[PDB]
Amino acid sequence: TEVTRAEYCAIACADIFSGAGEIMASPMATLPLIGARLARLTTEPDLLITDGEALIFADTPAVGAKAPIEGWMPFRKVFDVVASGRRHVVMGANQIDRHGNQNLSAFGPLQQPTRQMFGVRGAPGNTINHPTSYWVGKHTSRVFCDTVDIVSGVGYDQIDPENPAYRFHHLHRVVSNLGVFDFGGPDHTFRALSLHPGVTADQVADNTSFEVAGLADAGVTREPTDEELRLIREVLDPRSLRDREVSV
Amino acid sequence: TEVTRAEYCAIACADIFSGAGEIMASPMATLPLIGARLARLTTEPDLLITDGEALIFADTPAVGAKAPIEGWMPFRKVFDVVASGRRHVVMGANQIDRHGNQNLSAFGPLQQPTRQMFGVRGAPGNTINHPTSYWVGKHTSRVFCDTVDIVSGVGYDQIDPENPAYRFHHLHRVVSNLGVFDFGGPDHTFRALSLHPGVTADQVADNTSFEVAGLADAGVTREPTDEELRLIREVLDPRSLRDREVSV
Amino acid sequence: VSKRDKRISLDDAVGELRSGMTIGIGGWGSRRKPMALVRALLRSDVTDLTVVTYGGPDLGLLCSAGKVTKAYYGFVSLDSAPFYDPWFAKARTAGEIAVREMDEGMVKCGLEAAAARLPFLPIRAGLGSDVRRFWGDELRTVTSPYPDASGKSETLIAMPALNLDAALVHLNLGDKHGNAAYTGVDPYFDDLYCAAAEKRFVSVERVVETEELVKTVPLQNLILNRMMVDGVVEAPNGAHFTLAGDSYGRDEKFQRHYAESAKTPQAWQQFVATYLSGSEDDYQAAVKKFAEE
Amino acid sequence: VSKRDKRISLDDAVGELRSGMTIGIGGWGSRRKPMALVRALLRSDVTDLTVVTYGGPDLGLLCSAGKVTKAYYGFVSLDSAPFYDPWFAKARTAGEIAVREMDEGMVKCGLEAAAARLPFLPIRAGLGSDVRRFWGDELRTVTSPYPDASGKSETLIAMPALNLDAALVHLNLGDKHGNAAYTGVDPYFDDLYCAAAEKRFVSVERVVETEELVKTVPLQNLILNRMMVDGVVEAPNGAHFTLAGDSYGRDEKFQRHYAESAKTPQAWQQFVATYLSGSEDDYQAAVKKFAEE
């Protein structure tokens, strides 16, 4: 074994889609993209993936590569996919709180922010309609904070159990450069599933504003298989683009 | 002048679209189709017309002829046009009552009719969304009856004035083999605008179940212009298809 | 590793259906109906169906077999002579089926609601019409929470979702994974039928390679992706006797023979024995011999 | 007799606009934006605008001129480096505009409602999110009149119609009557913007004969018909510096120059004097000379 932190992140992002079946995988960052395509070439061949613009890929290409297509997915049709539920998006996040409320819109007051990003984008529709996971390349207390400034992604404490309009909400995983997490802690709170090799519990605790459920008992992220390492290193990311987006 | 009853019906069907502007003309019978295309070649060049299947015509062809196209109008997009209001349909009718309720669905009880036709088709959406006119090739008391069996086309006594969802309803004309009518009589009742040459008021009265407003004072349908006669006889309907659908 | 191979037979696909199901049928009137799949239904014991359709000879054939309990439709038409389907007419005048007849635009709207997993969509069509009486309390209204500029709030039909247990559609080309395309001037609504349904069966004129599919037609004709299909059936001439885009037009003479055969017991029994009592291959052979008189 | 000749100049089209209008702008981010029409807006005195957009440098340029009072958008992005529009950012951090920021799917939904002349359409997107706080009482819910199978009724966002006084869109080809097509992989939503608006202006790379238009592109690319357009403007390179389907890609170097020029008074004044203070021809000449360094 000579596996890098980025390669553990890659297989953890592939594991996001374990059991996903025949749905659209929409990774919105390089590591989740390697992960989705790694899953598609190993245990989830029926995933749908696009070129990020408007074409559905038949084969699974290297990062930044073209492949023969199998269908058409312009932006207006993506919104049909979202409403249908047959999708699992992996979004980035500027802030994520203990219940999975997420912010990628802006910092500060809603009508006069202190820092502007893209706005809510599809985060509200994604989180209310279908499985949503998050990727954080630099796990810090500024990202994992007690309160997000703007709720662009719906967290578990927003759910009205009396209103079935909320029944499709499901935040599946948070993968960071430190480990794998979900919101399966008590009261749907942020919970450690594994820490990547070399990461200590104290390092996670020191870089998370709130308590991480199960942190003391979390095991180590699994080893990639030889096949996964071949696919990452030879097929999907030969140019080491993964290393640019993973901190330490 | 040597103008036939069918030719008076043709120019009366063209007059349906007077002032229509840039909307879709949807004639659903041969005489209204000659009329719509006659209007398009005289005073309403901006009408949109289709081949009855899925193509928007650029030029105006003879009945049953193809022409170069200008756009695409599959059935799913027709329903967008209907909801937009930018359309004037001319439907047939098995029954029309004094307030413009119309039936082309079936005769008899709704769940066990005595005679089945196509069902309501687009008549409910047409009559609630945009100008609607009717063509009746054989004006009889069975067509113009006190009560229709099934309301497929919405008449004026269905309108709720408190509900703006009804604000686009507008039945423009009824053209028959006997004359031109609207629902501008008192209480939005069936009213005679003109009788075709050779048609007497008694003939209309004897072939309408209810009283026709203004019948005693209705004038005679106008003469076609020489240009209209040329267009009908040489360009649009050289094979006399109009005569097959006009009774006496 | 491979994507799922969804190729199945006509009988296999109907083998997935159950009596009492709500089934949407694609095409429109006498246009690109999944007629081979309908014939496979007739040979089976699946019955007590609720059918959602822009109706044509698909609904007529199902009515001829007593397999329809309830029908949701915007119309029923053979499009060309003799225009009215005689079996739908017989079922209606005998009161053999319950109908939720509706405006044509309401069918599209109901399928869109189901596709979006919404319980309803608002629509004007239906207001003031006997669509209200066909449905009774099954069709309710919804009032806008925003008044119009006049201060009055619009109250519209709340078209309920037309959720389907199964969809049956026929397209011109597809691959073995369910990517599929139409050729010709109109997709009709087959993508919506598939999106509205739990189990989705697509028959195609020809199964091709994915790359062959995507280089044969424009992007915009790829109306089904793999998430919209559960089973793919190769059924050449599988829309007969309806038309099928660029593949073939309507078999007008055979449609007339179908309609006329409904008129008498002896004629219909003969039609059944000749065309509806064997395989699809048996049907296609008999239709070929009919064409040669 | 002839169909209406809708050909007008860029300034003519903006001459039809009024301060205080609600204007929808087509394209998406830095993709097929009607940038020539936006530049014609900048040269005019039209201001106090409510803008509905999938925002890119169109909204940035309007913000740089103080012409935006209120903005409805699903995002604002330059797509490529430097990604964030600096003028939108400045307007936001200065509190110069009111925002009704919303989920991306809600924009499409609002335009669809306006296109259908409906006061709202129900949608899940928005529930549980701060979209509710961006809008306050301007965004209300609607409860289904049909409960779900559990007996519980869904309460959904009632997305209000995004009715527009005007729409500005850019397409690749069109005729002088407003029939128009896109080339490339995505129509975005320009047909919906036109359908949602009272006054509709389409700029095109090239005005062609109707027959030339319909033989150049598949049927499915004819996304505007004559009922959807009021004025047609021939504007070659009229989407610069955004991409435009098969016509050209994004002028990445110039987009970076635009964004960097926002950083200082001297740089922006120079950008204004060089690119935004003359005709579209003056702009195109200056962009050409920029390209040659």
Curated annotation (Swiss-Prot), chains A, B:
One of its GO terms (biological process) is cholesterol catabolic process. Its EC number is 4.1.99.-. The keyword ATP-binding does not apply. Keywords: Cholesterol metabolism, Lipid metabolism, Lyase, Steroid metabolism, Sterol metabolism. Disruption phenotype: IpdAB double deletion mutant does not grow on cholesterol or HIP, but grows as the wild-type on pyruvate. In the presence of cholesterol, ipdAB double deletion mutant accumulates COCHEA-CoA. Belongs to the 3-oxoacid CoA-transferase subunit B family. Changing residue 121 to M: Loss of activity. It catalyses: (3E)-2-(2-carboxylatoethyl)-3-methyl-6-oxocyclohex-1-ene-1-carboxyl-CoA + H2O = 6-methyl-3,7-dioxodecanedioyl-CoA. The gene is ipdB. Involved in the final steps of cholesterol and steroid degradation. Opens the last steroid ring of cholesterol by catalyzing the hydrolysis of (3E)-2-(2-carboxylatoethyl)-3-methyl-6-oxocyclohex-1-ene-1-carboxyl-CoA (COCHEA-CoA) to 6-methyl-3,7-dioxodecanedioyl-CoA (MeDODA-CoA). This is Cholesterol ring-cleaving hydrolase IpdB subunit. InterPro entries: NagB/RpiA_transferase-like. Coiled coil: none annotated. It is an enzyme of class 4 (lyase). It comes from the Bacteria. One of its GO terms (molecular function) is lyase activity. It comes from Rhodococcus jostii (strain RHA1).
From Swiss-Prot, chains C, D:
Disruption phenotype: IpdAB double deletion mutant does not grow on cholesterol or HIP, but grows as the wild-type on pyruvate. In the presence of cholesterol, ipdAB double deletion mutant accumulates COCHEA-CoA. The keyword Lyase applies. It is an enzyme of class 4 (lyase). The keyword Lipid metabolism applies. Signal peptide: none annotated. Coiled coil: none annotated. It catalyses: (3E)-2-(2-carboxylatoethyl)-3-methyl-6-oxocyclohex-1-ene-1-carboxyl-CoA + H2O = 6-methyl-3,7-dioxodecanedioyl-CoA. One of its GO terms (biological process) is cholesterol catabolic process. One of its GO terms (molecular function) is CoA-transferase activity. It comes from the Bacteria. Heterotetramer composed of 2 IpdA subunits and 2 IpdB subunits. PANTHER family: KETOACID-COENZYME A TRANSFERASE (PTHR13707), SUCCINYL-COA:3-KETOACID COENZYME A TRANSFERASE SUBUNIT B-RELATED (PTHR13707:SF57). Belongs to the 3-oxoacid CoA-transferase subunit A family. This is Cholesterol ring-cleaving hydrolase IpdA subunit. It comes from Rhodococcus jostii (strain RHA1). The gene is ipdA.
